[PDB]
Swiss-Prot record:
PANTHER family the record matches: 5-FORMYLTETRAHYDROFOLATE CYCLO-LIGASE, ATPASE INHIBITOR/5-FORMYLTETRAHYDROFOLATE CYCLO-LIGASE
Catalyzed reactions: (6S)-5-formyl-5,6,7,8-tetrahydrofolate + ATP = (6R)-5,10-methenyltetrahydrofolate + ADP + phosphate
Reported effect, residue 60 to A: Reduces activity by 94%
Top enzyme class: ligase
Protein name: 5-formyltetrahydrofolate cyclo-ligase
Gene giving rise to this polypeptide: MTHFS
């Protein structure tokens, strides 16, 4: 009941956000070109070695450029591999940016290793230093509006376990994706980039 009114808020906020989003492609690119640079000069990106980063859908900052800089700097790159049955996902390691273009894709047309593909899972080899966080919306207070399936909230809690120190969670967002207040229940992000 109290949870219901919370899900209503989220639902509404998601709609509006997806409205404000679905932003010409060139604008989408401009804003990404800026966040990229802000990332490249970021202390926690510079310092971190094992990185988790997502493959951008059209209503999301484009991380293509960031991924290229990840490999140039001998960082261990990881990308999500989610399962549609539940709310489960592992960060699986990719060896080169070219590999992204061979991988299969999900119903969301998001690229990830298939079933038979045995991947090095981040938490099997030391967890993650930095996780780039996707999301429909964020507020300056740090909260996140996820896509509703609870994939990242669940994964971060798994990290907390495996890892002595928790990963630095870096949210990349459009000016458009930034909200006054976002309804919440579970996990905040250390930082949100934009502007
Ligand atoms: N690159 C990543 N992708 C990361 N990927 C995994 C997941 C994407 N989302 C999911 C996948 C299946 C779908 C679906 O089939 N919905 C069904 C059933 C869902 C459930 O049972 O409630 C439905 O429509 O009936 C919804 C959303 N994410 C973060 O999370 C992050 C996302 O923000 N962006
Ligand atoms: Mg993992
Ligand atoms: Mg708002
Ligand atoms: Mg406030
Ligand atoms: Ni798994």
């Amino acid at each position: 009941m109290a949870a219901a009114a919370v899900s209503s808020a989220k639902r509404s906020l998601r709609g509006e956000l997806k409205q404000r989003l679905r932003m010409s492609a060139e604008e989408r690119l401009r804003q990404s070109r800026v966040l990229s640079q802000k990332v490249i000069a970021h202390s926690e990106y510079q310092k971190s070695k094992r990185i988790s980063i997502f493959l951008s859908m059209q209503d999301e900052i484009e991380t293509e450029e960031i991924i290229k800089d990840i490999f140039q700097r001998g960082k261990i790159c990881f990308i999500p591999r989610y399962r549609f049955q539940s709310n489960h996902m592992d960060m699986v390691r990719i060896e080169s940016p070219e590999e992204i273009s061979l991988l299969p894709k999900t119903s969301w047309n998001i690229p990830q290793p298939g079933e038979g593909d045995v991947r090095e899972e981040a938490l099997s080899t030391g967890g993650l230093d930095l996780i780039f966080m996707p999301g429909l919306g964020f507020d300056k207070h740090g909260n996140r509006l996820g896509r509703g399936k609870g994939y990242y909230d669940a994964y971060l809690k798994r990290c907390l376990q495996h890892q002595e120190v928790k990963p630095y969670t870096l949210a990349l967002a459009f000016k458009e994706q930034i909200c006054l207040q976002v309804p919440v229940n579970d996990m905040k992000v250390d930082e949100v980039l934009y502007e």
